[PDB]
Structure formats: C-alpha cells, structure tokens
Amino acid sequence: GKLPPYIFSPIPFLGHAIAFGKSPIEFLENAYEKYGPVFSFTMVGKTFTYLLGSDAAALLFNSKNEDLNAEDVYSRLTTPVFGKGVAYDVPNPVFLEQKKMLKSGLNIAHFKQHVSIIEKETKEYFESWGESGEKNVFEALSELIILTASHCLHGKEIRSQLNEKVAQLYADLDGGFSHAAWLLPGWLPLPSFRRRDRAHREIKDIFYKAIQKRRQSQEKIDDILQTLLDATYKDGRPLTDDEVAGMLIGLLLAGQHTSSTTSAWMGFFLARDKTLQKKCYLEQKTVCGENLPPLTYDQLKDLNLLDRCIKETLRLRPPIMIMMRMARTPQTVAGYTIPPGHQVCVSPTVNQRLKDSWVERLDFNPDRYLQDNPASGEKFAYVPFGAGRHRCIGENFAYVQIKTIWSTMLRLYEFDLIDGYFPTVNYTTMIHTPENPVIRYKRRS
Ligand code: HEM
Ligand SMILES: O=C(N[C@@H](Cn1ccnc1)c1ccc(-c2ccc(F)cc2)cc1F)c1ccc(-c2nnc(-c3ccccc3)o2)cc1
C-alpha cells in the first residue's frame, strides 16, 4: 500500500475548505498539474481522494458498490428528503431495480406526449415576459421546469395541484441539502430541518391521495405514474404507496435543477455567440418548416446542432460537479493504494475541460463534436451523466425537456447579454448556478 500524494494543509480542521470553496475547479486543475491524476487532501475533518482524467476516473466508474459505496456518503442527507425505502436507504441491488422501473417509464411513447406538454407549458409561461425586456432566466427556467417535469414525470392530476404553496414545499425539500444538514446532528430543530421534514410529510400526502385516486379509476392512463403502479421487483412484489411517492419526489428533484441550471447556462452561451444562436433558429426552420408547427419527438431528433449545444453546455457546466464514494475496501489506481475510509471523488467538470485532451478547452464550441474528440475518443473524459452502476437514467428525458424548452424559446425570443456581461459561477450554492443571470431578450423575427 503506497498512498496517493497528500496535499498538506497547516489549517487544522478546515484544511483547504476556504481555498477549495472559492474556486474548486482551479484548485483541482492546479493540483492535477502539481500532483498528477490521483491525490488526497483533507477538508472540514475528512479525507478526500480525487481521481482526475479518464484513466483514473475509471476506478470509480467501474467499481462495485460494495467496494466504493454511495450510501455511506449520501444516505444521511438524501434519506430525509426522498424518504424511506428508496434510493440510498436500501441496499444498492434494490435501488438498481427501482432504477430499472424508472428507466422503463422513461420511454419513447411517453417522450412523445412530453414534447407537446413541454412546448405548451413553455409558451404559456413566457407570455408573462411580453415582447422584450431584461429578466432573470434562471428563475424563469426553474419555475418553468418544476411545472414541465411535474406534468411529464408526475402526471396531469398532480400537476394541476402544483401551486405556489406546493412549489415552496419542494424548495423546502431542497433545503435538506445544506451545510447545516451535513455538519450538524439531525436532532437539532433548525428551521430548514423542520421545513424539510414538514414538506416531506405534506408532499407525500398529496402523492398518497393521487396514487390511491388512480388505483381506483378504470381510466387506463399511459404515463410514468402508471408504469410505477404496474411495476414489480424480481421477487414479484409491487411497490408500496410510500415507495412510489419516494420515487416521485426523486423524479422531480432530479428533473428540475439539473435541467434548469443547464438550460440557463446554454442561454448565456448562445447570447454571447449570436451567430450560433442564429444558426440554431435557422435549424428550427430547416427541420420543422418555415411555418414552425408544433414540435414533435421525431423533429427533436433532427435538431442536431441544438443537440451539440446542449452537449457542449454540459461539458463546460455540468450540474453535478462531483461524484463521491466511500471506500469500504482498498482500491488500486495509478500505482497507488487507496485505503478504506477515504472518500473517493471524480469531477466531470475537470475531466471535461482537461488541457491534454480538449482542444481550446474553455471555448464553447458545439462543432467540436463533428471531429475526433474525447467524448468518442476516451471512456471517461466526458461524463456529465456519469457511468457504471450509479449512472444516470434521465439523460433522454433531460434532452427531451431541454430541447423542447429551448426550441420554443429560440422561436419566441432572441437573447442578448447585458453590457457584454457573461455570468460568473456562483460556487456557494449546491449546484453552481450563474451569478446575476439577467438576460436581455426581444421578440424573434
Ligand atoms: C441534465 C440533466 C441531468 C444530469 C446532468 C444528470 C447527471 C447525473 C449524474 C452525473 C449521475 C451520476 C451520480 C453518481 O454517479 O453519483 C446521475 C445519476 C442519476 N440520475 Fe441523473 N442527471 C440528469 C437528469 C436526471 C433526471 C431527469 C432523472 C430522472 C428522470 C435523473 C435520475 C438519476 C438517477 C436515478 C441517478 C442514479 C443515482 C444513483 O444510482 O446513485 N437524472 N445523474
Ligand atoms: O440530489 C442529490 N442527488 C441527485 C443526483 N442527480 C440528480 C439528477 N441526476 C442525478 C439525485 C439522486 C437520485 C435521485 C433519485 C433517486 C431515486 C428515485 F427514484 C428518483 C430520483 C434524485 C436526485 F435528485 C443529492 C443531493 C445532495 C447530496 C449531498 N451529499 N452530500 C452533500 C453535501 C455534502 C457536504 C456539504 C453539502 C452537501 O449533498 C447528494 C445527492
């Protein structure tokens, strides 16, 4: 056992907390340069080991959950949010089945319904934006996506109940993902803990009623809720109501912020590159016709440029900057032996931006995918949706959602930067959102 290089800090408990917190990507890129692909450090009492670049990241992406374990690092925070019997509250093999059920629900049939739903929700929402102005697009997209994702992933019944009170319940749930929740005992009656737990109760209740309501109807509905009510584990057991409601909460949380932040970033990338924005609008017309009829799933698959714009946005601004495991058993990578008790980390952000493999790395270039590039060229250089056992199941929905929304948005408006300001990254929020995401827009042609 030869340990990975350890980046010493004189600062007792915090370690590099402050430096890492200010700009993590720069921290990790500098470390990579000085120490190589595999290294360790301590922050706020804990020892972290990073695996940077494709070859090293392979260890995390290939590992069995018995070896590199997700619930050890996640369950404490997620279980009060998503609920019992779901996600990281059960053995991983169970979660894998639950994922299979969800995957089965995320199919082409349902996507075809989703496109119209999302186009409709989007046009209606942006009516309040009028003909022109300067508004906060991240807030717009967050508010819209909570609606679109509910409608698609929860259904019409639940969606019609989605008022501001319920939206706030969902925000209160997000609050469970706090520094306080990580650092402090659960038994402290902190406001955010109280809200989180209260909101979890009220939201489950709404889902309980909607679930029993559908079970009792003879109206055969073909949607994702139905797929869950009809699904079964290998043992044959159907999901309980509490299980289903748990999975519905997850579906929303997963469906919202990863898309909203991403969609916001794409907005500013396209605003900065007006020629690229024009080409996208022209692509709309080419594929769908000059009359611009209602979007269809099949038309989305032909929006190749828009697709590469999403792909490239994800490259430079992946919503999930980190993926972490607890090493239960010793692991070997790059000559080093990582001991049990280490938390093993990967950063899509760093891998997706690495000097050695990405040409003009900090450039937003959708066309980079028309040549040889590390997305096709390597295993794990490009990993915004992860890989292996804990890999994402929502990639196709997310693309459906983001494509439809932005397809519609390009049709409605042309977008510009304000005083040539391109938003900086707000590192203090859980998902790195854009700072001051106010965008200028005027009605399109
Ligand atoms: C742009 C949108 C999205 C991005 C960038 C994204 C990214 C990711 C990433 C990086 C992981 C790997 C987590 C890890 O290895 O620790 C993941 C896992 C997952 N995602 Fe997504 N995701 C997105 C949308 C969605 C959606 C819409 C859903 C549900 C419909 C979803 C459900 C999941 C689930 C269930 C997992 C598995 C977690 C696990 O096995 O531990 N995601 N996602
Ligand atoms: O929301 C979390 N995970 C997300 C990751 N995601 C989103 C889209 N694709 C993947 C997530 C994972 C599983 C699910 C999910 C699970 C089951 C299901 F049926 C449906 C969805 C939903 C999610 F939103 C999450 C949030 C916080 C944390 C957390 N872990 N540690 C912290 C933490 C640590 C230190 C300081 C501050 C926070 O935060 C871990 C995971």
Ligand SMILES: O=C(N[C@@H](Cn1ccnc1)c1ccc(-c2ccc(F)cc2)cc1F)c1ccc(-c2nnc(-c3ccccc3)o2)cc1
């Ligand atoms: O352990 C986490 N952060 C670590 C830092 N780190 C980052 C990379 N390696 C170490 C961390 C961050 C802040 C702090 C901390 C900060 C302030 C303080 F007063 C005390 C402690 C402690 C930490 F251990 C961590 C782990 C998982 C996640 C995370 N996983 N999933 C999410 C996520 C997913 C979806 C939506 C929102 C969050 O978040 C976020 C942070």
